[PDB]
């Protein structure tokens, strides 16, 4: 039942979500660590400031506060009491994206596997923020805040407290919450590596250009132009130089991490997209497959159907640092 | 008013009008809940003149709710002269009071952009009385502004009202506790995979080929937002009367026609909608262009 | 006032200003969605010209909105008098009475910054009324502190309503879809690539090298801006205002006057822009200053 | 009023106010944003006399922005004279009309921490008209709660607006973009290491290798400070107003001086700089002292 | 000067600070004498027992620039503007220059200190105040009717440290106020002085301050989480012996359960056994 | 009073040697405790000579504000005066007799925001600044002629309840100000005992439910987070009913459990009818 370090997967996330020393924390388990960060993440922002949105209120007060509001003010006959219904722009820390900070710090107090340093801290913060109001989170919440008026460090530790609140599980106790086993399931596993090798490649390979493409079948039906029966094809990646074109296609599997049969059935895909895929500049065509292996690293090309082809693999396990130099070194072989 | 006139131009199927009605008669209180563009508003001052038989203004009355909309408005309140405080009988007051007159004839009250405003606020009291059951006079009850208990005020059975709600904003996902109870939602589809709606453009000089393969795209799009439910759902999708407009001139239909309108009505709503994935709104102007 | 006249010294392609008439007529209503300094506010006060066909002010009403208007000031509201509130017709009302006193002319309503305010508070009644389809007095519709006696508003056919919506802050942006599909949104691009913005340059005594180079610079930074999508979005990217002004003394264009330009306005714009690394804001600056 | 009398005890380049009166010529407007401790609002003043050329009070206004302050008490609102309410024509009003009156002569205001307050909605119709190019009646404009259209308010060409802000906080910032454009941003360093400054403490019967001294060690502090960026940008790097004043009696001044004003202002300032590190706190601060 | 549990230098430091700087914070953890100092503090600079000068207020949440200076508020006929307190406060020592009145602000830290002062926060500052620094206030009708801080208003302010806010972090304000912190005074002899002429054990007050000092030290121990400011203070033993009841151990543990007991569990929350131990502690 | 009191006397004694001297305190307690029927008691057994006008009681709200509280302006027949509110009236009422003590209890004093109900006046009732060098001049007082000032006879005892979870932690402004002090039910007192006794209750109907119902409260307490001790039920219920003058018996109680206990117990638990039916079925039998 082998998966990779924990620490390795936040790097792969912090890419995944497009944007600090984990050596001091011992505990190895992944809420361990991400609380880590959100518990510093958020008492780096209190030191430069927490974001101030201007709420409106139209409240009824004893006085002129900004502009009264006459027709309410009339309506209700506020005046004889000494009142009216004046608007007034409040400025307080209660924002959307302030409230979800708070309320994730519940969840991450309430887990019941979890550093008890983490959560001593974690306590003290969610005690330090009195005005705020807690919330009841879903992701129709952070589907709002998707707008991104919010600050680039914002963005993240609202990443994080959107991780931790979809990996949130009741565990022994009603109350108590326990942490999803992240690493065993492939999909999300690989939907993080696909979007973390999307992400890692606009960053590091200033030198090419990185897009996902859309592809089009060559396919003409009689019946319809429309051709929606057709499987929809995009592309993983597709990173474009003057020089080569290249596709990847990447995917975390659990039976290739066993040093037997291979699973290559995505594969199968790939060639379509070359097939599919014309290029107007007529450089070259080539294909990548690259998989999460943890013990070693091994690379194979081939030359299949007139098409330059990469089976690959990287130690996830074996260093970040390293595994930065091991990415960029794969790409450059192929790319060129 | 002749159905011949109103239900030709219509896009909604002859089908669900019929259930509109069916409602309409029996409930009294409906609500046509659908995006923009599909024809909300105009069907009902259509249907309010299908129900009383003849077109007649003084029947029918039409009014949009917005946050300052409120009860002293509506129904009863108290307007400032150069000093003085009267009190002025309301639209729906008044308008009840020319239903009175006449039980027999159908009296229409149309109201949209219902969720704007909290029902509460306007209504009222009136809430109560308004409800299908609890009409007549037997039920009636004195005005919060009454001068005395005497007079009272009951919605007669007679009027029919009928509410324009717009499921376009992320908001309404917390839908008003006072619509569901006293108003039935009707849903109302986009309806471009209609017949209709392809022979209002084959009469305007329109190529068959090139209308279904519109509706082929735009189905597909539509599809692609109702497959959302976290930032949009089904309420989001697009209406059929981008394309329907500006074909007065006379001006064909064509894909510059069409390009116009994707590039100044689509394309940005599509940038307000999928602004997270901007390639993904290529991925879709393209395949509208195409 | 013609054509001509106006696209002399305007920065703007003529294919826009021509797709702008050709939405702006036929749907009457529309948006000018662009980065701030690309002349949004300089082309408006010119269309109400073109689109009249004279230069006369009359005809012409401009506001901009300040996130603290309010139905009470646009269109129907209660003020003190002395001792005691009257009712006040507001600015857009007092402007369509006077645009149904001659329908053949045209005229024109230029609300700026129209992002800002919650617009369905501040038109409540008129959303409805704008649309080019739902004017005249067929469709008639009584206000909200409109008096006793049955007097109905409606949005006269000759009015036309232009806004003017940056897009550079985004939480400021218009998410009411109901909303969205009244105007028309036409995209105003900084203009930087076009020949008739280095023409102006070029009289004002200025090398063509320096010219071409400027634009070379600039637009390599607007792609850096505009291919990130999480915060600098494409709207974000830098308009051509700056340029323009400062050079009516006679003051030459060349790096000791550009450099003033970058290390002022700029340069601040680009640490707030990105905030993340100074090794990205000391590149663009210096790649500039190059 | 001349430029050299205020030169004297100004620590702050003469380069940098050139600049300043250079942009402020141009743009109209400006902003001075450094850290607190830099006679941003020591200079404002003096650069407004220098900038009218003349010691007048009554044609300069300095206030102060907070989070209560509005349109309606900036430019115009409806206000209490009394028993009745009335139209309060605001400060900032009033100072335009008293500039209309004399065109030729420079009228300056000077606001004050402008970050706080709301400025979208504070300024509102403002924000187009401070513009450069768009003052003069040509770009009148009618006001929200104006009477009617032909009242308008313009801001007259002569007035020169000087905003004050300070970087310390993150949280209060001008990230209107729409707004920064505006402004004209001009920055401001705590000009420890100038010879205006160590004529300052010089002149005060003080050590001059202890000044060297005190300008080699914060100096550094500073650059500690603006390397970390992410945590602390440059903007928060520490002023020179804790060292220049407190000498008025006559105290020379000794090392003891500075350790006596070190514990009390900087010490605990340098504990929320470095809330994590309370190592790094005692290197910085002792190395002062050793 | 006498009765003072505080060390004299820095009472010492607060006197020169104040009167150079003219604006000074108090911060420290409730229970100090913080109040008392400040009140103490203000008759020495004032050199009479005047308490029409000083004037006490104490912050909270809801406070607003509407009641601090000015604002709009209602009369009997209808609505006018009414002066608040620190403009009525600062007008009554512009009548008076010579003698120094004070104002003293507790629980300072709750409010938005910007938001109630506003204007003067710039008008504070000791080199700021005079007539040509003066500025038109937000509800002042006419510009030329202006607000200045008079000389020789000094303003101390009271600080809670026990209740960290990581809301709004303002280093200006920083500067208009030189911070002092105050520690509770138990190894001070005067503190001792005190319960020692109370008829006081002399083995019984050496073992308090051992007590309490070992509790102390356990809270700064995690700086980040709690820390000197979160300390105990010692004004819980001074109130409720002036009756006549002498120091005993009896007399300790009633204030231990009475007030010691729900502070342990503020700062040590949801850890029972962590207040057992220190609580036991100080009963022994 | 002392003997009708189902709380223990040490508790009892306590609150007065606490409230002497700190002039203000509060009561927190799960519903059913007698926290009303406590403070009037203790208040007339502090004053010594039952004089109900002494003691004057408001319950607090979030609607509840300083116009209400202590002075406000209400309409009159034309036009407006200024309405003196129940804390001002009160106080200048006991400043006359600065002997007598007069006592004030503000039931539900958690809801609101103790703030914006007393303003001012939140400093003037902690006790070290009382009395006539405290004065401050209120909001609405125009002119500088009068000013309000608690006096020293006044103590504040304030009803909390800690019944909801839903309660974050208590507000800054009370814990500073106020002593908390946490009342057990007393079902095992021998007061409530032998208040039954009396009533010819049958010893062993009387020494189960005692039992039974503090292993309900042992469990509903055992709880760490979502229900604590605070939530534990009270003894209210078995008051009502007994002493009208009909006699204990066990179907008695079957009624009370269904009545009050057995919804109560669905809503702090709210998630398993089984461990709702295990607990009220013990309670039966
Ligand atoms: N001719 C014709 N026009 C239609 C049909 N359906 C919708 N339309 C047209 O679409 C335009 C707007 O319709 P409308 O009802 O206002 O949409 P809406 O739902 O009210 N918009 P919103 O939701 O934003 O309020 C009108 O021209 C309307 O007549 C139709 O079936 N036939
Ligand atoms: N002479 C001239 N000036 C132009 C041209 N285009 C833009 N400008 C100038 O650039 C400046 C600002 O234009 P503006 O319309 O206000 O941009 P904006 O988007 O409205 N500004 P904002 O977004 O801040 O409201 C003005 O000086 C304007 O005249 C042009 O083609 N010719
Ligand atoms: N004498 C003298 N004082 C100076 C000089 N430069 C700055 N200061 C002093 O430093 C203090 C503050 O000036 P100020 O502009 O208010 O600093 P600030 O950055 O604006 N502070 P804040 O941002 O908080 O308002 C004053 O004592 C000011 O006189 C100077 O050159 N000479
Ligand atoms: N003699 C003496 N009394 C003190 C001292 N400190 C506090 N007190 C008294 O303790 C009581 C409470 O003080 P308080 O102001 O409420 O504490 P603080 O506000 O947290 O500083 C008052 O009687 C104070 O005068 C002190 O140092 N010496
Ligand atoms: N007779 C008598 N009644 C008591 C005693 N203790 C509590 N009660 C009764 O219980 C009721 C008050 O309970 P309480 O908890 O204050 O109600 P709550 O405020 O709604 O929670 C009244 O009937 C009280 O008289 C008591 O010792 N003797
Ligand atoms: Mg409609
Ligand atoms: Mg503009
Ligand atoms: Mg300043």
Not at chain 1, 165 to 185: A, L, T
Not at chain 1, 274 to 294: A, D, Q
Not at chain 2, 65 to 82: A, K, L, T, V, W
Not at chain 2, 234 to 254: N, V
């Amino acid at each position: 039942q082998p998966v990779i370090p924990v620490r390795n997967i936040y790097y792969m996330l912090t890419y995944a979500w497009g944007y600090a020393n984990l050596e001091a924390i011992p505990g190895n388990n992944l809420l361990d660590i991400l609380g880590y960060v959100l518990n510093k993440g958020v008492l780096q922002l209190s030191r430069r400031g927490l974001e101030l949105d201007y709420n409106p209120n139209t409240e009824i007060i004893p006085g002129i506060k900004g502009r009264i509001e006459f027709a309410k003010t009339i309506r209700g006959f506020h005046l004889n009491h000494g009142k009216t219904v004046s608007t007034f722009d409040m400025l307080n820390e209660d924002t959307l994206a302030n409230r979800i900070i708070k309320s994730t710090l519940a969840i991450l107090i309430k887990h019941e596997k979890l550093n008890s340093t983490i959560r001593d801290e974690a306590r003290s913060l969610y005690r330090k923020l009195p005005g705020i109001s807690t919330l009841h989170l879903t992701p129709q919440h952070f589907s709002y805040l998707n707008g991104g008026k919010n600050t680039r460090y914002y963005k993240f530790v609202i990443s994080v407290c959107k991780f931790i609140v979809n990996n949130s599980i009741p565990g022994q106790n009603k109350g108590h919450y326990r942490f999803y086993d992240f690493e065993r399931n492939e999909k999300e596993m690989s939907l993080l590596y696909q979007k973390f090798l999307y992400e890692f490649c606009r960053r590091e390979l200033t030198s090419a250009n990185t897009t996902r493409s859309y592809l089009k079948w060559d396919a003409s039906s009689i019946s319809d132009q429309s051709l929606n029966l057709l499987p929809r094809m995009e592309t993983d990646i597709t990173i474009r130089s003057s020089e080569k074109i290249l596709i990847v296609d990447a995917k975390y599997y659990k039976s290739i991490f066993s040093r037997e049969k291979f699973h290559s059935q995505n594969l199968y895909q790939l060639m379509n997209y070359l097939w599919s895929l014309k290029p107007e500049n007529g450089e070259n065509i080539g294909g990548l497959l690259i998989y999460p292996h943890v013990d070693t690293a091994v690379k194979h090309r081939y030359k299949i159907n007139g098409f330059d082809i990469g089976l690959c693999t990287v130690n996830l396990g074996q260093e970040w640092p390293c595994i930065h130099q091991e990415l960029l070194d794969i790409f450059d072989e192929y790319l060129k | 008013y002749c159905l011949e006139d109103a239900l030709n131009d219509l896009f909604i199927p002859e089908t669900t009008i019929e259930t509109i009605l069916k409602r309409l008669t029996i409930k009294k209180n409906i609500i046509l809940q659908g995006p923009p563009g599909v024809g909300k508003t105009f069907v009902a001052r259509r249907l309010a003149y299908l129900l009383t038989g003849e077109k007649a203004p003084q029947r029918v009355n039409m009014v949009q709710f917005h946050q300052s909309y409120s009860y002293e408005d509506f129904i009863q309140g108290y307007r400032p002269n150069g000093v003085g405080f009267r009190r002025k009988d309301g639209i729906f007051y008044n308008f009840c009071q020319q239903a009175k007159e006449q039980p027999e004839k159908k009296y229409i009250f149309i109201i949209d952009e219902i969720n704007r405003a909290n029902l509460s606020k306007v209504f009222g009291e009136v809430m109560m009385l308004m409800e299908h059951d609890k009409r007549g006079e037997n039920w009636s009850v004195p005005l919060t502004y009454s001068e005395n208990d005497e007079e009272r005020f009951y919605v007669p059975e007679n009027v029919y009202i009928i509410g324009l709600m717009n499921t376009a904003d992320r908001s309404l996902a917390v839908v008003d506790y006072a619509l569901r109870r006293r108003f039935s939602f009707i849903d109302i589809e986009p309806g471009f995979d209609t017949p209709q709606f392809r022979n209002f453009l084959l009469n305007k000089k329109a190529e068959p080929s090139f209308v279904e393969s519109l509706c082929q795209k735009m189905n597909e799009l539509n599809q692609e937002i109702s497959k959302e439910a976290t930032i949009l759902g089904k309420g989001f999708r697009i209406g059929h009367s981008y394309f329907c407009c500006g074909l007065e001139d006379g001006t064909s239909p064509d894909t510059q026609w069409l390009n116009e309108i994707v590039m100044t009505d689509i394309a940005p709503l599509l940038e307000e909608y999928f602004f997270d994935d901007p390639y993904k709104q290529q991925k879709w102007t393209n395949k509208l262009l195409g």
